[PDB]
Amino acid sequence: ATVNQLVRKPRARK
Amino acid sequence: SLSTEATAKIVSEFGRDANDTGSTEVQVALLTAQINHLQGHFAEHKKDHHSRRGLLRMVSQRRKLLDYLKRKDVARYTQLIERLGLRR
Amino acid sequence: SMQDPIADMLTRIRNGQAANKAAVTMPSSKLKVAIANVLKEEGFIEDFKVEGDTKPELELTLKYFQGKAVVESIQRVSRPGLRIYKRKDELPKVMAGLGIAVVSTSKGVMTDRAARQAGLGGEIICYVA
Amino acid sequence: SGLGQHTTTAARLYHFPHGGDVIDSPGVREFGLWHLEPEQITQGFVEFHDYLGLCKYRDCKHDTDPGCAIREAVEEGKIAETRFENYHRILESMAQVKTRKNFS
RNA sequence: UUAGCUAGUAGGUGGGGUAACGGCUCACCUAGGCGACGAUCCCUAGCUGGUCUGAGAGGAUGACCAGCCACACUGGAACU
RNA sequence: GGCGUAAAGCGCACGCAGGCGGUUUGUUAAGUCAGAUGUGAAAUCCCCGGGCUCAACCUGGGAACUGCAUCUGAUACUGGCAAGCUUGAGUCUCGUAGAGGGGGGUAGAAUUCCAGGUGUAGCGGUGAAAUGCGUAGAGAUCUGGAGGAAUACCGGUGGCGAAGGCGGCCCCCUGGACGAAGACUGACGCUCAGGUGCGAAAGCGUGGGGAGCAAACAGGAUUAGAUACCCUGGUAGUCCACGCCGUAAACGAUGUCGACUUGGAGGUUGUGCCCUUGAGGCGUGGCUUCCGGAGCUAACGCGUUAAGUCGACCGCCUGGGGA
Numbered sequence A: 001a002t003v004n005q006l007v008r009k010p011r012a013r014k
Numbered sequence B: 001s002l003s004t005e006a007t008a009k010i011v012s013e014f015g016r017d018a019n020d021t022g023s024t025e026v027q028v029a030l031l032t033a034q035i036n037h038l039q040g041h042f043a044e045h046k047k048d049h050h051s052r053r054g055l056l057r058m059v060s061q062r063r064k065l066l067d068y069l070k071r072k073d074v075a076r077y078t079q080l081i082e083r084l085g086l087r088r
Numbered sequence C: 001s002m003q004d005p006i007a008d009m010l011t012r013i014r015n016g017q018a019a020n021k022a023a024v025t026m027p028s029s030k031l032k033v034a035i036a037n038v039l040k041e042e043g044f045i046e047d048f049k050v051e052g053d054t055k056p057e058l059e060l061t062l063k064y065f066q067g068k069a070v071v072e073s074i075q076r077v078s079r080p081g082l083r084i085y086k087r088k089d090e091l092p093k094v095m096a097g098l099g100i101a102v103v104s105t106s107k108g109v110m111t112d113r114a115a116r117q118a119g120l121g122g123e124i125i126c127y128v129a
Numbered sequence D: 001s002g003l004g005q006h007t008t009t010a011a012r013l014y015h016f017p018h019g020g021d022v023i024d025s026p027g028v029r030e031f032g033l034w035h036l037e038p039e040q041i042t043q044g045f046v047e048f049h050d051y052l053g054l055c056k057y058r059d060c061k062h063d064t065d066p067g068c069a070i071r072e073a074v075e076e077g078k079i080a081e082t083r084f085e086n087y088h089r090i091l092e093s094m095a096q097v098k099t100r101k102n103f104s
Numbered sequence E: 001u002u003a004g005c006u007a008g009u010a011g012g013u014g015g016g017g018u019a020a021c022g023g024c025u026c027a028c029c030u031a032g033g034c035g036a037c038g039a040u041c042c043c044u045a046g047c048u049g050g051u052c053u054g055a056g057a058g059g060a061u062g063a064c065c066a067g068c069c070a071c072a073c074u075g076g077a078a079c080u
Numbered sequence F: 001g002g003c004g005u006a007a008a009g010c011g012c013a014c015g016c017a018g019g020c021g022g023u024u025u026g027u028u029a030a031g032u033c034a035g036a037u038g039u040g041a042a043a044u045c046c047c048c049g050g051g052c053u054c055a056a057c058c059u060g061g062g063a064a065c066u067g068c069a070u071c072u073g074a075u076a077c078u079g080g081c082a083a084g085c086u087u088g089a090g091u092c093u094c095g096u097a098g099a100g101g102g103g104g105g106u107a108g109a110a111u112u113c114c115a116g117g118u119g120u121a122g123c124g125g126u127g128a129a130a131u132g133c134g135u136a137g138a139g140a141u142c143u144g145g146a147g148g149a150a151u152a153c154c155g156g157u158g159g160c161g162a163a164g165g166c167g168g169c170c171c172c173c174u175g176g177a178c179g180a181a182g183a184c185u186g187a188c189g190c191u192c193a194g195g196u197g198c199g200a201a202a203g204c205g206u207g208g209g210g211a212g213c214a215a216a217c218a219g220g221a222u223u224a225g226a227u228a229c230c231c232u233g234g235u236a237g238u239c240c241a242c243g244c245c246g247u248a249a250a251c252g253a254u255g256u257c258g259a260c261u262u263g264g265a266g267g268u269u270g271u272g273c274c275c276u277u278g279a280g281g282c283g284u285g286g287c288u289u290c291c292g293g294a295g296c297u298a299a300c301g302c303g304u305u306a307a308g309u310c311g312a313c314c315g316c317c318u319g320g321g322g323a
C-alpha cells in the first residue's frame, strides 16, 4: 500500500 | 533513581547554577550514575529480565542524548566523555 | 505525528464542515495563512483571525448553504511520503474546471486559473472540490 | 498388545486342488440385525426349534415371563446357561441398536 | 534456497608499449579495492529506433526496414 | 486493491542503516518551476496535402518524439547552512496507586505418610458393580511429628506489566505508569529490513526433590472388541538450581505514533475550588467496560480507546488442495 515499500521491492508479477 | 542529596549535587556539578537542570549534559549524568549504580545489581540478579528492560531503556536514552551534543557542539562533547568515562 | 500540518489543517476543516460546527481553531503558521486567505478569496470560507504570538492559533469561520456543506470534499494530493510536481501546462483541474487546485509557486499561492496568467508550476497542495 | 489386526482385504478367490473355490473374509467386528422381527431370532438357533410351543403363553419374551419352558430346559441342563444368557443379550442388543432408526 | 569477492587485484614511481590516455605490460613501493543504492556466483537473452495491445499509465516482444555490436566448422596466433 | 471473522498485522520490545519531520528569520539555489540554445538519424504513428482509375501502398512539409545536457531567471514549498522560538519530545521537585520482576525468611488450613490413644465390620468407589484396602484393627475421631506444592474468603468486564503473563504475609534490592505546582534544555522526534533480548505449556541435558495430580503402563468394569470413556493404583513430568529448545486459538483473530469529529450508563485513579454546613456540591486529567447518533462496513458490528475522516513508517497476502 505504501509507495516507500515499493521502493525496496516492487509488486511481484505472477 | 537516587535520593535528594545525590540528585541535586550532580546538577550543581555540571550545571551553571541550581536552575540548570533541564540541559542535556545533566541528563547524561543522571543516566551515567544510574547505570553505574546498577552494575552490581544485575550481576546478582541475571534472572530479573523485567528490570533489565528499564536498564536497556536508559542505555538507549543515553545514546540518543550523546548523539545530540555530538552533532551540534563537539567541544562540550569531548569534555563530558572523559569526565564521566565514556567511549570505552 | 503532525508531520504534514497541511493535511492536519484539511482534517480539521472537513470534520467541522460536515458536523455542523460554527467555527474551528487550529495552530497557525505562515503557510496555513497563505492557504486560508486564498480560500477566503475563493468563496469557500468566510473569515480568519490570528491569536497569540508565542503560540500562534489560527481560527476559521465555517460556511453553509441551508445547513449543507459548502466544501463537500477536499483531497490532499502531495505529501511528505510522495512529492507531486507539475508544469505550467500539466496543471490538473478539479471537477473538469469547477473546483480549484491550490498550487504554490514563486509568485505566491494561487489557483491553476490564476496560474494561466502567471505561467508557472510547482507543488500541488490540495484539490478544493 | 492384546488385540488382532485386519491386514488382508475383503475377499480373494482361489481354487482347491480337488474342487470348489475359497473366499477369504475381512476382520469383522460388526453385527447387523436390522433384517427381521425377533420371531426370526427364535428360528436362528437349532435346538431351540424343538422346544417351541411348550411354554405357558402363546407369546413369550422368555426372560421376564413366568413359566418359560425354554428356561426350564436351560435349568434342566440339556441347554447350557452360556447360550441362554447370550440369547437374551441378543434381544437386549435389539433394545440398543434399534434406537435412532435404520431402513433399507 | 548466492554475502563476502578480489594479489596485476586497488593506487604510486620508473622502464616498456600502441595511432592516442591508461596495470596495456614489467620490477619496485603501499594495502588497499569492490559491496545490502546488489559486489560476486548461477541461469537466461543480441540491444535500440519500433511493432502489437491498452482511454491513458502501463504491459508483452525485437521477423520484414534502418542503426550498432558480436560471430563466419571448433580453438589459438600473427602477418599483410 | 486489501489485511476484526473471506488469503493476509511478524508473539512482543529495543534500536543502527533507510524513509520522514513542529515553528520564525536569513542565506544557498540543491530538488522543483519559467525562458532560451544545442540535441533527441531516417523510416513507423499523428495533421493537412499530392500520386498510382480506387483502396492498400508510396510520398511532401509540419507536429510528435513528454528525453538529456548547458546558460539565464524567480524563492512560495522541499533540501543544506546560520541564528532562533516553544505547543512536540525530555529533565527536576512534591506526591499517590498497583498480583511489576528478582532474592531471602515466615504463617495457617487442607492432602498424604508415620507414631500413639479410644473404637468395630466394613471402608472405598459408580448409572449399577468390580479391581483395591481392612479384624496385623481399616475407615472415622483425637494427640504429636515429618515432607511436598498451592495460596480459600478478600476478588470485582478490578489493578499492573511490551507481551506470554502476574495473587498468603513481611523485609531488602529494583523497574516503569500517572497527577499537581513551577523552573529548565531547545526538535533533542516518529518509525523500523538485517541485528539484539524477552517470550504459555509440553519436551530435551546435568544434579537434586517428591505430597497430591498424572502420558505410557498395571488391574477391574463397559463392550462386538476397550486400545478410549468409568474406577482402583502408578513412572516420566509437574518442584528447584543450571542450561538449551523459541513454537501456541502467543486472540482485542485489529502493527506503532500523532491530529481532529455529537454524546450517556458506570468503574478505577488523582487533583482544584466550595454555606468543610456528611464519606457530599462544582469542575478537571490518567486508565477501563457496556450502550448508541452521524459516518463507515459484504453483513455481523465498530462508532472519541474506530473498524469515522487523515498523515508518518514498517510487516504481510494474490483461487482451493499440493503445502
Ligand SMILES: Nc1nc2c(ncn2[C@@H]2O[C@H](COP(=O)(O)OP(=O)(O)NP(=O)(O)O)[C@@H](O)[C@H]2O)c(=O)[nH]1
Pocket: D005, D006, D007, D008, D009, D025, D026, D027
Ligand atoms: N503358533 C501358531 N501361530 C499361528 C497358527 N496359525 C496362524 N498363526 C499365526 O497367527 C498370525 C495371524 O495369521 P493370519 O492368518 O495372518 O490372520 P488373519 O486372520 O488372516 N488376519 P487378517 O484379519 O488380517 O486377515 C500369523 O502370524 C500366523 O503365523 C497356528 O496354528 N499356530
Ligand SMILES: [Mg+2]
Pocket: B001
Ligand atoms: Mg519510583
Ligand SMILES: [Mg+2]
Pocket: none
Ligand atoms: Mg606508468
Ligand SMILES: [Mg+2]
Pocket: none
Ligand atoms: Mg534482406
Ligand SMILES: [Mg+2]
Pocket: none
Ligand atoms: Mg540488422
Ligand SMILES: [Mg+2]
Pocket: F001
Ligand atoms: Mg480485492
Ligand SMILES: [Mg+2]
Pocket: none
Ligand atoms: Mg481467513
Ligand SMILES: [Mg+2]
Pocket: none
Ligand atoms: Mg499482537
Ligand SMILES: [Mg+2]
Pocket: F042
Ligand atoms: Mg525519426
Ligand SMILES: [Mg+2]
Pocket: none
Ligand atoms: Mg521526415
Ligand SMILES: [Mg+2]
Pocket: none
Ligand atoms: Mg509518413
Ligand SMILES: [Mg+2]
Pocket: none
Ligand atoms: Mg483518393
Ligand SMILES: [Mg+2]
Pocket: F110
Ligand atoms: Mg496439612
Ligand SMILES: [Mg+2]
Pocket: none
Ligand atoms: Mg531558553
Ligand SMILES: [Mg+2]
Pocket: F204
Ligand atoms: Mg529426556
Ligand SMILES: [Mg+2]
Pocket: none
Ligand atoms: Mg484412565
